């Protein structure tokens, strides 16, 4: 759902 | 493996043209194939394996998502049977996704950890681990979903050991390590409040040494710190 | 085929579901199988059969231009010879976009287009096979590059041929149809003159029958009207 | 290079 900030590419 | 018969710096060159072309299944493959010639990475190609599987699991993540989301709607009351479909359909995308954690956490075990002695590429590695073992804990719903989750825990616990005692607290790998396990403490482990203290703890830490750096090492450090503010921002 | 045992009720419902997760590659499995059933396709089919592999075939004509440019950069004067991996890529990529073309082409000519008698499905399936000679022409070199040539020409013109006798001047499928069949003329056929005189013409003609539709079917013909005079502008 | 405009998901 609200997805939270990870590192790296934001590919999903 | 399909790429045994290709020169290491082939592969590597090749995943740089798959990069640029956002072919990223191919570039995977290529870097898995360079993994495979049993020599240590560089932090180049470090990264450029990292950023090629996190495209591909990207991708499956979120059409797991959408799926999901359709069968969690199929399944309510007053919805309309619709039969096995949509079910198969996500177990399947489900299982080419666990596919794929487990191919990188198959690098990572066949050899890539054990020959990695220096912080920089030790801490990379077991941060991956955690990662890949965090988006097998997504999708996990059975009786191995705990043992997944304390496998998470238990790489980014010695990846964050080793970082807090070999590297200063704006190192980039060290800040992104932080930003990911306390994602994994909000929404896998279900310890909102360790999240947020860690990201708390890691962009003040970082503010403070923030002054020691570069003006091109200063950007890197305070990308990643936004990243970690962003998500305070959502958490409080 | 590896669809065969699924139903093909299933097979349109999982491609409508891979659509959703933008999921391609499996969509465009998934109506390869209900083709492969021998039934003919609905209008609502025909068109997720062609936003597949239009997607699948996209991603792949994006690479191969990243990669055809980078390789005439390294085959210019003062050029550092970098070895054989980026024709080989290219190569490989290549290979798999035709692949796709001739899996398209292979499902109109077994059997889509001998069955189809309506126009709508017959202009149809005959500019998808322009389309796909098409994309196969975009990268062909040798000695059968006129042939796949006037393959699409020939495929395009069939097309053209019955959707002026049979379909009104606002016919989306149409409009579609010289859309495509102008950039053919303008960038394959080397014919820029043909390719503006035919979308002159067909915008102009759609334009004086707009009076004839309803709300919706208006805003359906002047979507691809808008493509038309894009072009135009470009052009001239 | 510079793509025109073809019918359908511009996916290239
Ligand atoms: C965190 N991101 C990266 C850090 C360091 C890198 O290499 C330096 C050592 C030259 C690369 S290279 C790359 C890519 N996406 N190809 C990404 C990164
Ligand atoms: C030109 N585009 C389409 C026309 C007609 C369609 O079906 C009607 C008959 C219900 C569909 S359905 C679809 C999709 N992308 N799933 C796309 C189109
Ligand atoms: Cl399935
Ligand atoms: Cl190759
Ligand atoms: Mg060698
Ligand atoms: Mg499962
Ligand atoms: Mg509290
Ligand atoms: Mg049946
Ligand atoms: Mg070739
Ligand atoms: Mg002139």
Redesign the pocket.
Same mark, same amino acid.
Do not use: D, T
């Given at each position: 759902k609200l997805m939270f900030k990870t590192e790296?590419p934001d590919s999903d | 493996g399909a790429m045994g018969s290709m020169e290491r710096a082939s592969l590597i060159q090749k995943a740089?043209l798959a /990069?640029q072309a956002e072919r990223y299944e191919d570039m995977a493959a290529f870097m898995k194939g360079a993994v495979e010639k049993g020599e240590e990475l !560089?932090? /180049?190609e470090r990264?450029?394996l !990292?950023?090629a599987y996190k495209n591909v699991v990207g991708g499956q993540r979120a059409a797991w998502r959408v799926l999901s989301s359709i069968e969690q709607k199929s399944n309510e009351e007053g919805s309309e049977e619709k039969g096995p479909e949509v079910r198969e359909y996500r177990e399947k995308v489900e299982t080419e996704l666990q596919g794929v954690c487990d191919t990188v956490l198959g690098l990572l075990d066949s050899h890539l950890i054990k020959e990695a002695g220096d912080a920089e590429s030790r801490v990379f590695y077991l941060k991956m681990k955690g990662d890949y073992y965090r988006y097998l804990a997504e999708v996990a719903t059975g009786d191995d979903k705990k043992r997944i989750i304390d496998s998470a825990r238990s790489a980014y616990q010695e990846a964050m050991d080793i970082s807090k005692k070999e590297m200063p607290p704006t190192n980039?790998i060290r800040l992104?390590l932080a930003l990911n396990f306390s994602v994994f403490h909000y929404e896998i482990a279900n310890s909102p409040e360790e999240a947020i203290s860690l990201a708390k703890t890691t962009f003040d830490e970082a503010m403070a040494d923030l002054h020691t750096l570069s003006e091109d090492s200063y950007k890197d450090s305070t990308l990643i710190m936004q990243l970690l503010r962003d998500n305070l921002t959502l958490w409080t």
């Open positions: 790296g | 740089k /990069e !560089s932090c /180049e990264n450029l !990292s950023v980039p992104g």
